[PDB]
Amino acid sequence: AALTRNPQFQKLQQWHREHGSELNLRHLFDTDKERFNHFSLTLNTNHGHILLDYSKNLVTEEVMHMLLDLAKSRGVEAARESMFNGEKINSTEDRAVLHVALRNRSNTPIVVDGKDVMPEVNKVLDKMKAFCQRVRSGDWKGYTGKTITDVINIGIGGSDLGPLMVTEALKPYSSGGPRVWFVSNIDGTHIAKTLACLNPESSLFIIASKTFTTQETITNAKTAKDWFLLSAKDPSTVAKHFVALSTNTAKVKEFGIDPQNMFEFWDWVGGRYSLWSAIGLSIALHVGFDNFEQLLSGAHWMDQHFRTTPLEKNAPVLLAMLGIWYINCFGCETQAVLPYDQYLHRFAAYFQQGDMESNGKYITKSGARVDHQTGPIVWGEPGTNGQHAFYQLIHQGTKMIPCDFLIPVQTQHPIRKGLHHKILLANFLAQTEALMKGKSTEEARKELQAAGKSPEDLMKLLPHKVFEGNRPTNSIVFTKLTPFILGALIAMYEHKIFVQGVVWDINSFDQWGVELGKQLAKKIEPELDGSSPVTSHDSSTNGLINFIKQQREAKI
Amino acid sequence: AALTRNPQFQKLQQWHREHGSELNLRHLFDTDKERFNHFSLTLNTNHGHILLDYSKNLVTEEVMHMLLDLAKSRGVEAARESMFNGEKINSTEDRAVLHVALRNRSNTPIVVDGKDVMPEVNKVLDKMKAFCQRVRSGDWKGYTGKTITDVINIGIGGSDLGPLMVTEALKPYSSGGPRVWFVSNIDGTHIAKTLACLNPESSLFIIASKTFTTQETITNAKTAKDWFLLSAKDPSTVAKHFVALSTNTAKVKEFGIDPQNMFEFWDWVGGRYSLWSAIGLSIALHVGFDNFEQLLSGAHWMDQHFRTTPLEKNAPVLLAMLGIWYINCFGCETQAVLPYDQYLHRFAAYFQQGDMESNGKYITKSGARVDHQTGPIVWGEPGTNGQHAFYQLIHQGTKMIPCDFLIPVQTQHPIRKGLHHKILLANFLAQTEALMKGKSTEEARKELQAAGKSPEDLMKLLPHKVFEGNRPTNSIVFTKLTPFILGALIAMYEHKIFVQGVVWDINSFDQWGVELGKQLAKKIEPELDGSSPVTSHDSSTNGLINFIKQQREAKI
Ligand SMILES: O=P(O)(O)OC[C@@H](O)[C@@H](O)[C@H](O)[C@@H](O)CO
Numbered sequence A, B: 001a002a003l004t005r006n007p008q009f010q011k012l013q014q015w016h017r018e019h020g021s022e023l024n025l026r027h028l029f030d031t032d033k034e035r036f037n038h039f040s041l042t043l044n045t046n047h048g049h050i051l052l053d054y055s056k057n058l059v060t061e062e063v064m065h066m067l068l069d070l071a072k073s074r075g076v077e078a079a080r081e082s083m084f085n086g087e088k089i090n091s092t093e094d095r096a097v098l099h100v101a102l103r104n105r106s107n108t109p110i111v112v113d114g115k116d117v118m119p120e121v122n123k124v125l126d127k128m129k130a131f132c133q134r135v136r137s138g139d140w141k142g143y144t145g146k147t148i149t150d151v152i153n154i155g156i157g158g159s160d161l162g163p164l165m166v167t168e169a170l171k172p173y174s175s176g177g178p179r180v181w182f183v184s185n186i187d188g189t190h191i192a193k194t195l196a197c198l199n200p201e202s203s204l205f206i207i208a209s210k211t212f213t214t215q216e217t218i219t220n221a222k223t224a225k226d227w228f229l230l231s232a233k234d235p236s237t238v239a240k241h242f243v244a245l246s247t248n249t250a251k252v253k254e255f256g257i258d259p260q261n262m263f264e265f266w267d268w269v270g271g272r273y274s275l276w277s278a279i280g281l282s283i284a285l286h287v288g289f290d291n292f293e294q295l296l297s298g299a300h301w302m303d304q305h306f307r308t309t310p311l312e313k314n315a316p317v318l319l320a321m322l323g324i325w326y327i328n329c330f331g332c333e334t335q336a337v338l339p340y341d342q343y344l345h346r347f348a349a350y351f352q353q354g355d356m357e358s359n360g361k362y363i364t365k366s367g368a369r370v371d372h373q374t375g376p377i378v379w380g381e382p383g384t385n386g387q388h389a390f391y392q393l394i395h396q397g398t399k400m401i402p403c404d405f406l407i408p409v410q411t412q413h414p415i416r417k418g419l420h421h422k423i424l425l426a427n428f429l430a431q432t433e434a435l436m437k438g439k440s441t442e443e444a445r446k447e448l449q450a451a452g453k454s455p456e457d458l459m460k461l462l463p464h465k466v467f468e469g470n471r472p473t474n475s476i477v478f479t480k481l482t483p484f485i486l487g488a489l490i491a492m493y494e495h496k497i498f499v500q501g502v503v504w505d506i507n508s509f510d511q512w513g514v515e516l517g518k519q520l521a522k523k524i525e526p527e528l529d530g531s532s533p534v535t536s537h538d539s540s541t542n543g544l545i546n547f548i549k550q551q552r553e554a555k556i
């Protein structure tokens, strides 16, 4: 309700109704040689540069002004401070939101109802490093005196995506580290296929679960233990092959893991923002603690940029408001994330959760139902592959789709004297250029006539060759995808999401939308047993269950 | 535009504007005990059953009737026959569309240009089987007399995603076959990390490219060949380690591969519909030819169901029209594909290309520009993971998102005596029930009161715990995910895509939208070499390029 009442918002929307359709990227660049200079920012982190070019967006200096005025009147700055200061901004759960403390390497005090949290944060960090050291050095032996060769993280959602995405992204920095595996789905196939290729002797399992009660995780963990025990037959050895990352000690101990091997994080760490805490143990074990600290450092650098930079040149804010523009004014349902980097193949999926689970809300902080759009659908696949799969729709479809193109200037594998990367870069550049420029009917007609096409054949194919263009994109280029830079990029989007949540006046840090499904699932599980028909639900659920019971023992 | 002029379409549209928002799933089920029976389709393939339950959709008998009348008035059946009969329906390229011929196990003649295509189709299948047997049995030897332990498919888009998705989906049926790898991205990382795990002596590369001129594929191919010859040495050994799947004989020879080592397909085989042709060699090598023929047989079965079934009971037609309903009447931008199966982890991605590249068009067969929506943005991740990642938005966001839930009754890994699959099934069922049913304010309040919440805690939380529900879903349940069933499922969606294209009167089989990007990339490629700044493009393209040249030398 708040947003739609805001005068800055109304002014912005009225302007859009009057001039929105007028805006044409090709025309804007053709009439302003300083567009790139005026609509981009270069960030020097001292550990590489980050160029955020947002010039190929449907905005003018006037549009940007109104967007910033809106961010201001919506209290983005005061909201940011409240988060960094440990205030309980996660209202529905009455909790603080402090993933920024997890990477607060300046160690500036951050008190939550009485005490500074940093001491506990750094205590867990030290414990992690000391542990990674023992594991990666062979010091930590299995139940038969052998060294650890494989680490298996068992968790789902926030306790899975972050570590997986990061270890994939930083694979080049895993030299000398154990092989890391990730089991998340309850689908038996996941754990089964993973355990098939593992020696219980040199295998270390990490049970990652904030609540340590999640059905998928606990079930997978128990199955892993059975698998392990079948070989090491002796319960007392699980303490050598099972560690836990949780906030609850009782359940961990109950599972059979000693509190000494429990790396804890806190309630003001949201799952989808937990890879920076003990949840990132698998990351540290894979790339070493030095690199993990660089990861955290990169995020801290971005945290500072977000906190001290004027809105007009604040990356997270600029990305967020541009998003608001397309979402609330142009009505675009989605946001595409297209990294031209094979190592970042799980990047889009990570923010699919980070963004959608955070802002996929419809009730404001005041308890009022929104009367405007909130979080968008995030999606995408790494660069050069997408061009041969779905760019067709982005270029000539009937949907407006804001796209974020990302790529590192320097590749981790400069094979063929850099030939591959040069081509990758050319495509990265050419695609955003094409989306902006397009190709007019006249340009396409000349091409066809030069191809000796008959008037009949020229007319029949002509329109299909036209690219209307005027499709907006953001180009984010960084020196190299290192642990530090990656950390800065993730934090950057974390804050983009934070800013949009504030503007929409929703709680980006809770997730009550998962309860109903969990409840109905618990009531169905017992009903699946046996061959008796179920009639307790709607005819559809009843029909599906009965189909399942009937086909349960059908021989193919 | 044909669709907007259609009277059945206008009637549908008018009805929606007048009663659309009145449809409430919970109400529909509560007042119609026959809903499931009236809106579900059960297919017995004699090799497993497939249940398409579309009752949880915002439709009534009357709506389904209007939808079917539209499919009829748009000439869906006549278009289908034209495709199956080899007519050149790919109008912009003047080519036939015959992926159906590739799996025509009945061998009924399909004539193109006065000649039956089946003889050539089967000749290639026999060649494929013969080659597979040699490699699989160990008969085929490397340049050092060693058998083949690894098969590397080098290709992109249509020559990649299909075999990749299917080999992943059918892992259970790959016992014996050599390890299969897929290289696609030009990003040097992709081929570098793959080659690092191979021995040139026992590696067999498959260059998959219809044209055999695609830059990414040819460049990757050349890099692999150099890598190989690095150890081998003489150009003569290449014939034992490289084969090609293409239509370009001249180029294949030019590359260094001699015919007979080239498995061909034809121009009427669209890349995104080519896994059923020679492009599926990697699938055959991985799971054996018997399983591959099962895959083809499954699709053929579906082809037959599509061709002989009355529209009202035609699976792909119903799927198609329900989509039209949500796209052109409700205005939904996306389509979620959520398979509750880890093996199908790339299923959604496969149809992201198959659907979006096919129907992401804006020009009709008559040359008119569409004045209505076309293809939707396809996306998703396997279940139950999604439930912890983005379902928050599907349940409580501000977007209507049609969802296709898929799951096999029987699992390939019934570990823990079926415990994992029992839970997976329970969630599959509960999620759609939840999306449909929701949870009212009063229902939520009663729960909060029972939970012992205080008046002030109950009041701040209440709103956030309400699920408005009324979110549509399709539940597709099949006995087991076998080669045959997977084939039927893929074909089912291919035809869904076909039907929608017909209704929108667009050409679902060309892809002119990729041309602009490719040509602009060829222009930038040589401009990256120099150290001199570039000024020949828009200021953004210029700025990005210059940043790259500056940061290229940056030491980190
Ligand atoms: O097992 P855990 O650690 O309690 O996580 C259980 C998952 O449902 C949860 O992490 C979910 O991804 C979100 O809340 C993250 O913000």
Ligand SMILES: O=P(O)(O)OC[C@@H](O)[C@@H](O)[C@H](O)[C@@H](O)CO
Pocket (backbone or CB within 6 Å): A388, A389, B156, B157, B158, B159, B208, B209, B210, B211, B212, B213, B214, B217, B270, B271, B272, B273, B357, B511
């Ligand atoms: O190298 P190929 O086989 O010519 O494929 C080149 C790819 O651009 C192409 O397959 C693309 O995915 C689509 O047209 C498929 O319909």
